[PDB]
Design a protein around this ligand. Sequence first.
Ligand SMILES: Nc1ncnc2c1ncn2[C@@H]1O[C@H](COP(=O)(O)OP(=O)(O)OP(=O)(O)O)[C@@H](O)[C@H]1O
Ligand SMILES: Nc1ncnc2c1ncn2[C@@H]1O[C@H](COP(=O)(O)OP(=O)(O)OP(=O)(O)O)[C@@H](O)[C@H]1O
Ligand SMILES: Nc1ncnc2c1ncn2[C@@H]1O[C@H](COP(=O)(O)OP(=O)(O)OP(=O)(O)O)[C@@H](O)[C@H]1O
Ligand SMILES: Nc1ncnc2c1ncn2[C@@H]1O[C@H](COP(=O)(O)OP(=O)(O)OP(=O)(O)O)[C@@H](O)[C@H]1O
Lengths: 12, 542, 279, 253
Amino acid sequence: GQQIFSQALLNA
Amino acid sequence: KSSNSLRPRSNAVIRPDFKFEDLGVGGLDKEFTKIFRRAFASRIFPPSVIEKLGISHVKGLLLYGPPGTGKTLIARKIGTMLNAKEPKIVNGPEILSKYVGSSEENIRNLFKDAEAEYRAKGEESSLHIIIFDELDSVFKQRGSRGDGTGVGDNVVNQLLAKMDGVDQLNNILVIGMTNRKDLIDSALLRPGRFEVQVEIHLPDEKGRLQIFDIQTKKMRENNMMSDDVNLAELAALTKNFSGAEIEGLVKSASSFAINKTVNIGKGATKLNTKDIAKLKVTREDFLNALNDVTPAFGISEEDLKTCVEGGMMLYSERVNSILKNGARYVRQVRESDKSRLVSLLIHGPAGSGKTALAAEIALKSGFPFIRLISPNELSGMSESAKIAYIDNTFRDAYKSPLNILVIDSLETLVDWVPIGPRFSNNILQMLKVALKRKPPQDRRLLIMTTTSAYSVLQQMDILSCFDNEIAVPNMTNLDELNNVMIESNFLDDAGRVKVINELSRSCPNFNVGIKKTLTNIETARHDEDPVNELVELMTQSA
Amino acid sequence: KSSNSLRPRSNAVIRPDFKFEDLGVGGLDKEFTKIFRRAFASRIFPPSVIEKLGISHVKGLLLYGPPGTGKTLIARKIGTMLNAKEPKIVNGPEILSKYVGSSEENIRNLFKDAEAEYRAKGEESSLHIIIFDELDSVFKQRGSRGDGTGVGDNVVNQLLAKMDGVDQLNNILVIGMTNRKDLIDSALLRPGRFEVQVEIHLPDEKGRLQIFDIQTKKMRENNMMSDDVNLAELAALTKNFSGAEIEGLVKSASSFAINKTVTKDIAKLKVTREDFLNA
Amino acid sequence: LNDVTPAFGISEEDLKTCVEGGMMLYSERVNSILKNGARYVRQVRESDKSRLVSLLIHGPAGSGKTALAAEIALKSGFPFIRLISPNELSGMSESAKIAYIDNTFRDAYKSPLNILVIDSLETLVDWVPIGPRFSNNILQMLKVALKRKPPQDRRLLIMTTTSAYSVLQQMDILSCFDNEIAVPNMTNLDELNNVMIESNFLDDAGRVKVINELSRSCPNFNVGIKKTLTNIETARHDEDPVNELVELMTQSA
Ligand SMILES: Nc1ncnc2c1ncn2[C@@H]1O[C@H](COP(=O)(O)OP(=O)(O)OP(=O)(O)O)[C@@H](O)[C@H]1O
Ligand SMILES: Nc1ncnc2c1ncn2[C@@H]1O[C@H](COP(=O)(O)OP(=O)(O)OP(=O)(O)O)[C@@H](O)[C@H]1O
Ligand SMILES: Nc1ncnc2c1ncn2[C@@H]1O[C@H](COP(=O)(O)OP(=O)(O)OP(=O)(O)O)[C@@H](O)[C@H]1O
Ligand SMILES: Nc1ncnc2c1ncn2[C@@H]1O[C@H](COP(=O)(O)OP(=O)(O)OP(=O)(O)O)[C@@H](O)[C@H]1O
């Protein structure tokens, strides 16, 4: 019974 | 250009060539007057006077009701029969996204074109429409259980801040539809956000006639319906039918009429030019179709038919008196305008036949709305589930102007056993509070409850909820047995004679009850139909 | 386009050559009449007449029964012998995902092709089919299931809004199989969503005879079955059997014979009554 | 005014619906009790150190207590009026009931003057005489909350209605009520006719006939007003002559 979000990094 | 004469707006919204017979929605007629006065009445008067009154237009509309009634049809017709920009349809949970800040952006992007055009032009901007479907999916009460992820609150906050905020906007109309308005947030239902709220209910008999005439319109004008079809009769035959089941009925009748020519399967799948140019849907097709579409609001009527599977043999004379009393009470509840709640109790010895009499009275009453609560339906569930079921059933009965409820075997709904004594206090209290709550204004109810342990109900101190008692004594004389045997076809006349003659010698103060008598006759029909078996069984059972 | 044209459809949906005798399912005859009358009857008549009557086609089919009695078999046969498009199969809870908002995006992707083809070719579109398997696993009554994160309600609402919404579709047919019809939601069974409901039950004696006949066929025409085997007696001895049990019986007897023969005696292989009785 | 409806004023309508049957002054004791209630309202309005006054209203079942309390409450004119009754709490769980009661009591400490009405105390705690069975937690919550003084310069008047005086005596909960009021049943046959004229059941001659017949064959009259009104309503549509009315009255008595 859990859920999750997500973030993002750009390119070096 | 607006001349000196105060003439109506150039690009009006509703135009002057409009009438409620063009929409195509039948039944609801007062609701439409309300909707079209409150919302689309301040956009037709010339802008000058509406500007001299200092009032802004309403920017919200909510439609709620049971399943299969006409909400989405109204939304669709309103969206695509006006003079405005195309609607921005959104399905129920079509907003949510995966990344951290994309859901709120999706809710923000709906208003931007409207903002731009209001900023650029002013009061001449064309109306914009956006429609939320299944509103009760994401916008739930803040701070409640559920939505463990922090999404249940950010979405609601964004919508609240964007519908009435620090920057004004009055060229939008947002419309929402739902089956449960008890879960939508409480700050979304105040003037300024979703002002007009309308409930759409099941249709009336004249409403059913209007819906039937609406559906079978292209069929009649192309000469494809027979001349022995009377729509009034069909409206009469359909009792618990919603707007979305008449359509199913019509299409099933069409299938029956089609299938005769091209018999799918078999070898008769060959289409003959002659007989498809003379198609006609007839009455028998409709009557046959009535056996396919089973209404979902009338299941209990089949259980009230099952209850009386043994037939009402009018033995004795007390039965007629009981039935007459029941009819009198039904008539009184029908006519009187002040008696808005009448409750009865039907008590007697076990096996005397109470449920059958209650079911017979309820069936012959002829009311639109009838339901039954029985131990069978509640088997295996838990206490909370049972209370929820009882509450839901009692709430469904507060609509419509006439209702009937049959509560069966009260003492076994609360888990009674005399050793402790043990029972459930929660269910007992719920029923005690439910059998004294008057329905909403302008409604009536008639609650008939049976029991077989009168004394126990007396001890619990619950004998104040009821209003009148009906006793059902069991058979005592010996002619009643003769009538039952005559109506059951046990033996020939001679056989009945011998059985009654012998029984006279070995049975004083005969007292059995009908439910047992029928079973004894049934089982005695096999072993020894002569007197011996029936006499032995009736002696050992009495 | 239209006009009076009393000639069959351009690309008929069923076929020019069809008969129930070759479908491959035995014991269910009334059920097939009902299904093919109510569902595939309006897709054969010329489009002109159907347009005149103001009718729309059926967009659902639910069929339920006890374990192992011929439900997936029907769902397979319907979706492979109808000149339609490739079925879109979703078996079990194959949609749930652990990212917020990605669970229902899988339910919205099953209808994209149908919408795209409907928007271009209005009423000349081919038939699209999607099969839901174990329907009762995820689509339970909304509001009653135990507390959680609120994904059950979103899934049910998404399917409800996609099956019958503000944008109309007239190309889709969706099939559902389940063993417990009571658990399904109440609003999914309304006419217009899952209109035709059918029940598959254990067969009677004639059903058992027909199943036996259509199971042992390729071994009766290849001259591999003895002459002392009588299927009427076997249909009489097996009582309360299901279709799956009869198939198991057949392959068990075949295994008996094959194990018995075990160099080139295979040329004479033949299944006999004794193998069936031992099975 | 029929289109827009308040959202906070959803409990004064219920109080207004409890006196739907109408008030009839069939005697003078009714006037006396109403005057006493008005006196208490005046005292709580004009005083400064008496920030909490609690009353009890008790009597035989069916004597019309809730209607009388609602009538006193509605004529006060205070800014804030609220009612707690079994109908509101039906279907909830124990914890939900406690939370609801606590929040309603905490919402009464805002306005300068308040009135709170508790209906059928015995049924709020689920009392059944078989066990005896009842809920202890709710009883303790109510007992604690009926003696707590409100914050500075705020006044609250609590009125609670019960029909099991003896049961409350047994629980030892009778120390948290300042004054008590009784509402005895109608006991003089003349009062019946006083009601009858107010209801216009039958003609004057019929009224004389019924009163004379009952006086002939109905000593020690004891009915209660609710039952009397129900009987008159039933007798309107079945048989106007005395027979039905006299039979029903002698049955209830
Ligand atoms: N008042 C009505 N007049 C004519 N047809 C109606 C009416 N109400 C319903 N229908 C028929 O019902 C069909 C489906 O109803 P509708 O689209 O309104 O469902 P709904 O009320 O939104 O249901 P749900 O709760 O499942 O979303 C409509 O296409 C129309 O054929
Ligand atoms: N008045 C009647 N006349 C003829 N048959 C009757 C009558 N009442 C009941 N029956 C028959 O009684 C049988 C059903 O019994 P029923 O369920 O009414 O009994 P009951 O006393 O309510 O049961 P229980 O013992 O569970 O409390 C059916 O055969 C019905 O035909
Ligand atoms: N009516 C039938 N006629 C012929 N074969 C049948 C029939 N019913 C079942 N079978 C045989 O049963 C095999 C498996 O049955 P199937 O997979 O259709 O069962 P099911 O109803 O889907 O089972 P479950 O409820 O376990 O999912 C089929 O391959 C076929 O061999
Ligand atoms: N003095 C009165 N004169 C006339 N009608 C009255 C009077 N007092 C109450 N009534 C009416 O009679 C009924 C009063 O009974 P009500 O149920 O309100 O009180 P109760 O005794 O607390 O009830 P319960 O029977 O539930 O214990 C209501 O219809 C009210 O309108």
